[PDB]
UniProtKB/Swiss-Prot annotation, chains A, B:
<keyword id="KW-0597">Phosphoprotein</keyword>
<dbReference type="Pfam" id="PF00343">
    <property type="entry name" value="Phosphorylase"/>
</dbReference>
<comment type="subunit">
    <text>Homodimer. Homotetramer; to form the enzymatically active phosphorylase A.</text>
</comment>
<feature type="binding site">
    <location>
        <begin position="292"/>
        <end position="297"/>
    </location>
    <ligand>
        <name>AMP</name>
    </ligand>
</feature>
<dbReference type="GO" id="GO:0008184">
    <property type="term" value="F:glycogen phosphorylase activity"/>
</dbReference>
<feature type="site" description="Involved in the association of subunits">
    <location>
        <position position="131"/>
    </location>
</feature>
<feature type="binding site">
    <location>
        <position position="31"/>
    </location>
    <ligand>
        <name>AMP</name>
    </ligand>
</feature>
<keyword id="KW-0328">Glycosyltransferase</keyword>
<dbReference type="GO" id="GO:0000166">
    <property type="term" value="F:nucleotide binding"/>
</dbReference>
<feature type="modified residue" description="N6-(pyridoxal phosphate)lysine">
    <location>
        <position position="654"/>
    </location>
</feature>
<feature type="modified residue" description="Phosphotyrosine">
    <location>
        <position position="215"/>
    </location>
</feature>
<keyword id="KW-0007">Acetylation</keyword>
<protein>
    <recommendedName>
        <fullName>Glycogen phosphorylase, muscle form</fullName>
        <ecNumber>2.4.1.1</ecNumber>
    </recommendedName>
</protein>
<keyword id="KW-0321">Glycogen metabolism</keyword>
<feature type="site" description="Involved in the association of subunits">
    <location>
        <position position="97"/>
    </location>
</feature>
<dbReference type="GO" id="GO:0030170">
    <property type="term" value="F:pyridoxal phosphate binding"/>
</dbReference>
<dbReference type="GO" id="GO:0098723">
    <property type="term" value="C:skeletal muscle myofibril"/>
</dbReference>
């Protein structure tokens, strides 16, 4: 049908059809008379999988022969989504499979919808890891993703009575055709025990053993025949475990619970023992695997030349003392040499400056669970603080500020401080964020070792986030400038010479309209909700958090409703306001925000005076597969975090690439986005970081805004009196109290400028031609935000390896 | 190599080789340079599996078209062993695969040894179910095996310091290529709750739900292209289960524990709640599946014409009140009609008369777990006792004896009484056993309904138990009388005309010697134990139980040792005494018996005066795969249970078929075996059932034997004084005390006759030619003990269906 989806040539189509029928028969043990759509999905998945393995085996043998430096990306989250379409796109099989299935009498899009998301992440940090794996394979790097194979990923969100309900994400119920279990490469992981000092060093003894069994998933590069590996560990009890009899067997569950479920906290640290076990489990198993592979190439001087370990946040921070443990206790290297190797091997990426999100583990937990590691951490700290003391003599407060050990009621280890001390590179994820790190929370460390601190602005993969989710747009772009932009997104700049092209303007606006119609149809079919496809699609999708200010969006929605009710017969640009995202099960305020959004919808959507001019919909169960649907459909992207709180954002980049305009604060990557497109082509509003600082020094008084803004006062009075909850009048008292008395994120302070800016958006939407021209200027300048650019920078500036676009033999 | 293993013809060998390489590459994701023997096993297993599926799909579609009466064999145990060789034998693929692997540079026997046993059973009852499935498929019956897919089967037995140690049988660690998960056919099972009475009947409400997910395993018939199904249920928690958050997800384990582990009790009832849940789980899921399949052929009058349910012991006895529940509560049939259908559908097989083995469930357990079923059981009992009262007016003690409800400290339900009341047929498993049932424990029931009581003498499959485990013997037999005996074992009678054939005598003795050499080599390679292959191989392999009298065997061994030590320079027929079998983890006496056996070995095997004349070896980890090795190697089969205790035995039949002579009591199937071969050709000794009864009436006094038999006195004095345990002199005090004061099984009473009989065995072994001629007379008359005969009798006399040897189209 379309050119970007590859060739459907006779030979391939015939061969795909026969392999489909073979899998249906031999693999699924079904015939055409009893097969369901799910059986057909699996037959297709197995057929596409076959095409991977040949390339998978030869990529890994290529790395063995050439022995390049290996990159190990350690993460507790890999937010992968669906794999089928991504695999077809990267292998140039999409049109052939589309033809093959059509000839078998099947609709491939229907089959694609049967696949479960691999929801092994919470949001931005987890999705970044997935985009990174794609880019590393596309750039021909010898890279491995290492994590945990959670039996249950992020919970499925149901909305009941306007409230969030959680249910288990049993994503493995029907099997996972993409993974290959590798029980032969099972490795032991140790917990608890005690430290014994002998004549020849320390020994960690009397430990409890949990086995780590790896499952490998292929990661295909974009049309380069490279297939890398994501290896995820699963926890297994040893066979002599607790070995009355029946109980001992049932107790195996305790060990295997380590890999059972993903902790659903986003930007919030929960100091639970099971989480700590997960963190060590991934680290201990991964490092043994790394060292094994290194020895199979004695002398650890070459270790940093052959190995890079990237820590995704502090979650795998125990890699630092674990590497020290192995080098010192097991390989018998002296401390100083081991430390040199460790530092040159490890690099750390920070993803947030929110204090409640920083990992600070109680010493008493580490003492019991990992007694040798605590000893190593203390020694690291002592030696590090001796360096600080020598650099800044007599600065006693600096010593306490920089210590890895935090004193107080309970002593804690600051894992971020551990990561900086033990890494040769520390990076933030957007220019403003990296500057904030150097100026505020890691200022002391920057002053000691300025060379360590870098920026690596985040990106997204244009494969999943353009070609896959928006084939209509990818096609009209390819018609003008060719296909090379898919692996060289900077080429999109060539589209600036089409900004006054009447044909292109019409096509861009046409693709958006089609996307909006398709998404409007999805909402009817799957959720029985009705929307006007002619309205402005105003969307905010991301995890529910106070810093992200879904509440500010809510206030605007209510302002629009109140203005309509005041002047009903006055014309307003029709809007469909869509808000979606999950709240952590124990985050009360976030759960209340979801209830507020649905409650506003219940009033607004059923007011006869409003008509089809304003609709408020809560998008249930937001996840990767849903993002691929709503993002191509959006007109307006809401990126309205309080300045200085969103480290980067990546959802922002997805919207820009897909033809939505952005309303946003000068926060995270929004700054660089506006810089690339031009500020005239972005809807920037609100306080800058400097303005937030000024307000904090003076003291934030929300009552001031309430007193001086009558439209804001009305909303607060409506919320308090029970306008949006007539049966439970005080339902939202907690929300009002927070807004009025303890709002960390200064919702009221940005309200006026936000509403004003939204008026300017509505004004531009009234002029379809000029709206679209601004859109083209956004898409054309979105090149910098490809994760291929990001990964190229990591490769050159941190890992010390060169990317390659050269094909491997097929 | 040998004719019975099929054709290895060019076309097939080439096609097997290419499919092997395809699986190694695409299925296992390996190349020849990294592949291990295990990878090669799996590639072969997948290759052979492919040949099953075509026949599997067409068998099941054949049953749909023809709509025959279906046979449902319900069992908590299916002791399957290994599947690869059995599949090759039944599909006539053994020689072709042997050739194909040889040409790939692989040894197939080495590959076969990598497969884990499917150890989903304890012993005889579990193995019977497996032989039965094989015979039902071979006889073309529309039969289904239904059970539980235990994550852990019977424990692996390690011997440490002479003591049994248990370890988890993690049989699924590397995967199971034979099974196919069927998550689409998942069914709900209900537990707990309460009973609600409405205007329109009873309702079972507020229940906890556990999901039952089926896994299907193919069961191939012997060269008839029939492939039946064994469906095993796995427990799964529902997704809203307990749905703080993390705990709710981890608590899913509680529901899924239902299918976690096989209870390791053999001939002993343990009234544990988890066991009861397992029993209902299998029954509830199975019956829904049965009814679904029946409706997809409204009127339940035809139900017994289209369905037979065979209960393997009382373990699935809840099928009776569950069928009533479904028919009465859900289908709204009147009681009397539902009862007629239930009785005509169900049949019950009893496997033991030992009182401690009978299932008697506490009413309070059933009240809480299955409140509706208890109500139905009470109603069944009331109506049944009204029939008894009408047949035997005024016989009040009969009423209490026959009641399904047993009064006492705790009220219990007698599950055996439930089974008789609710079944149209009740059978024992050997002629003597079935007679004992009618004369003793079920006398009252036999008097009420004589027509219900039948005998079905047990059998073994000659596929696994001759062709597979003893190809050498199968070949020499085939040379003379052809191949038809494999599915018509009665043809072995034709071998009687070769009893004076000098060529045949030499060949029979040659096959045995080769088997003994091969097994002697296995013991060195895998356990580093040394044995004399020229000695008489005296073997007792079976679960360790007091009734089986491994202790009587021990006493003989010690008698032989004492006689040698008394007259060292006197000639004795050299023996290798081998004893193996597992003890239930909480069966103290059985564990002590294992320790005694190893302790005797420690003294006997290292006495320089004994030399190579006497060896005592404990066979570690006895299981199906080990049985296939030791049985073809045996000269003497020990079947020495106290008369009236071994319902049938099946190990006895395996030895007879494989060229061992039998020393045994007139118990179980030994009686029919001796009848078939002639008593002159069996070594029968000891009390008959009548003699045991006489001794019980008089009172068994063990001291009498101790006082009058000096050789027995010496042994007891040796045991007591610490001769066999010098460091722990009183180690065996419990054994001695039991033997002297509370021996339920009268070990001493059979000692004299046993030792005398053993002398006659040794005498015959001195004459190789006459030993072998007696062997030929045994093998030649073993025909009756094919499970094909047994299943034919079930089919004709209980299920009301005709067996068929006709091939299905390939
Ligand atoms: O716990 C956390 C901490 C940070 N981030 C996000 O990481 C993304 C990738 O770097 C950033 O784009 C985003 O600003 C940040 O909140 C998370 O998603 N979870
Ligand atoms: O709990 C039990 C009860 C009986 N049997 C055995 O069943 C076999 C098959 O019918 C018989 O051959 C054997 O005599 C009996 O002990 C068991 O193996 N377990």
């Amino acid at each position: 049908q379309i050119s970007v989806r590859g060739l459907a040539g006779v030979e391939n189509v015939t061969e795909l059809k026969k392999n489909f029928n073979r899998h249906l028969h031999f693999t699924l043990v079904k015939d055409r008379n009893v097969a369901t759509p799910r059986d057909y999905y699996f037959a297709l998945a197995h057929t596409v999988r076959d095409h991977l393995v040949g390339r998978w085996i030869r990529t890994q043998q290529h790395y063995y022969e050439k022995d390049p430096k290996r990159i190990y990306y350690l993460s507790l989250e890999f937010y992968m989504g669906r794999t089928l379409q991504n695999t077809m796109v990267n292998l140039a099989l999409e049109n052939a499979c589309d033809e093959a299935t059509y000839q078998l009498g099947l609709d491939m899009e229907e089959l694609e919808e049967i696949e479960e998301d691999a929801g092994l992440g919470n949001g931005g940090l987890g999705r970044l890891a997935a985009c990174f794996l794609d880019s590393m394979a596309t750039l021909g790097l010898a890279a491995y993703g290492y994590g945990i194979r959670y039996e249950f990923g992020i919970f499925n969100q149901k909305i009941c009575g306007g409230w969030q309900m959680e249910e288990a994400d049993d994503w493995l119920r029907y099997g996972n055709p993409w993974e290959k279990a590798r029980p032969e490469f099972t490795l032991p992981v140790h917990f608890y025990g005690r430290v014994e000092h002998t004549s020849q060093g320390a020994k960690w003894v009397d430990t409890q053993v949990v086995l780590a069994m790896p499952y490998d998933t292929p990661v295909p590069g974009y049309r380069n025949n490279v297939v890398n590996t994501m290896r995820l560990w699963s926890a297994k009890a040893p066979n002599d475990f607790n070995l009355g009899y029946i109980q001992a067997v049932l107790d195996r569950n305790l060990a295997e619970n380590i890999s059972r479920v993903l902790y659903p906290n986003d930007n919030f640290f929960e100091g639970k023992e099971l989480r700590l076990k997960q963190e060590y489990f991934v680290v201990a198993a991964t490092l043994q695997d790394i060292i094994r592979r290194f020895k199979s190439s004695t002398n650890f001087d070459a270790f940093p030349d052959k190995v890079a370990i990237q820590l995704n946040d502090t979650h795998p921070s125990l890699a630092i003392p674990e590497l020290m443990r192995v080098l010192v206790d097991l390989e018998r290297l002296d401390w100083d040499k081991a430390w040199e190797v460790t530092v040159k091997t490890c690099a750390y990426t920070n993803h947030t400056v929110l204090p409640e999100a920083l990992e600070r583990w109680p010493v008493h937990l580490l003492e019991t669970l990992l007694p040798r590691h605590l000893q190593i951490i203390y020694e690291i700290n002592q030696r590090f603080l001796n360096r600080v003391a020598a650099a800044f003599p007599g600065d006693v407060d600096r010593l306490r500020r920089m210590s890895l050990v935090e004193e107080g009621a309970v002593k804690r280890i600051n894992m971020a401080h551990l990561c900086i001390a033990g890494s040769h590179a520390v990076n933030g994820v957007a220019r403003i964020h990296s500057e904030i790190l150097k100026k505020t929370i890691f200022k002391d460390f920057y002053e000691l070792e300025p060379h360590k601190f870098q920026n690596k602005t985040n990106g997204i993969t244009p494969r999943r986030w353009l070609v896959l989710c928006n084939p209509g747009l990818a096609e009209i772009i390819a018609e003008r400038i060719g296909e090379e932009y898919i692996s060289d997104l900077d080429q999109l700049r060539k589209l600036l010479s089409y900004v006054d092209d009447e044909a292109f303007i019409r096509d861009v606006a046409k693709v958006k309209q089609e996307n909006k119609l398709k998404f409007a149809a999805y909402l009817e079919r799957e959720y029985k909700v009705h929307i006007n496809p002619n309205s402005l699609f105003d969307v905010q999708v991301k995890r529910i958090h106070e810093y992200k200010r879904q509440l500010l969006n809510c206030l605007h929605v209510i302002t629009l409703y109140n203005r309509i009710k005041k002047e009903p017969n006055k014309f307003v640009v029709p809007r469909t306001v869509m808000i979606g995202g999950k709240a952590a099960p124990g985050y009360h305020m976030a759960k209340m925000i979801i209830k507020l959004i649905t409650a506003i919808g219940d009033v607004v959507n059923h007011d006869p005076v409003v008509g089809d001019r304003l609709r408020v919909i809560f998008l249930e169960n937001y996840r990767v597969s849903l993002a691929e649907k709503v993002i191509p459909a959006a007109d307006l992207s809401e990126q309205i975090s309080t300045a200085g709180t969103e480290a980067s954002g990546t959802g922002n980049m997805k919207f820009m690439l897909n033809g939505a305009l952005t309303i946003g604060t000068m926060d995270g990557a929004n700054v660089e986005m506006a810089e690339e497109a031009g500020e005239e082509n972005f809807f920037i509003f609100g306080m800058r970081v400097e303005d937030v600082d000024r307000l904090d020094q003076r003291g934030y008084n929300a009552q001031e805004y309430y007193d001086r803004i009558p439209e804001l006062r009305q909303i607060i009075e409506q919320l308090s009196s029970g306008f949006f909850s007539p049966k439970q009048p005080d339902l939202f008292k907690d929300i009002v109290n927070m807004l009025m008395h303890h709002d960390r994120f200064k919702v009221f302070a940005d309200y006026e400028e936000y509403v004003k800016c939204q008026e300017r958006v509505s004004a531009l939407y009234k002029n379809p031609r000029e709206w679209t021209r601004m859109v083209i200027r956004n898409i054309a300048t979105s090149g910098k935000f490809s994760s291929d650019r990001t990964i190229a920078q990591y490769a050159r500036e941190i890992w010390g390896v060169e990317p390659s676009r050269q094909r491997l033999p097929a």
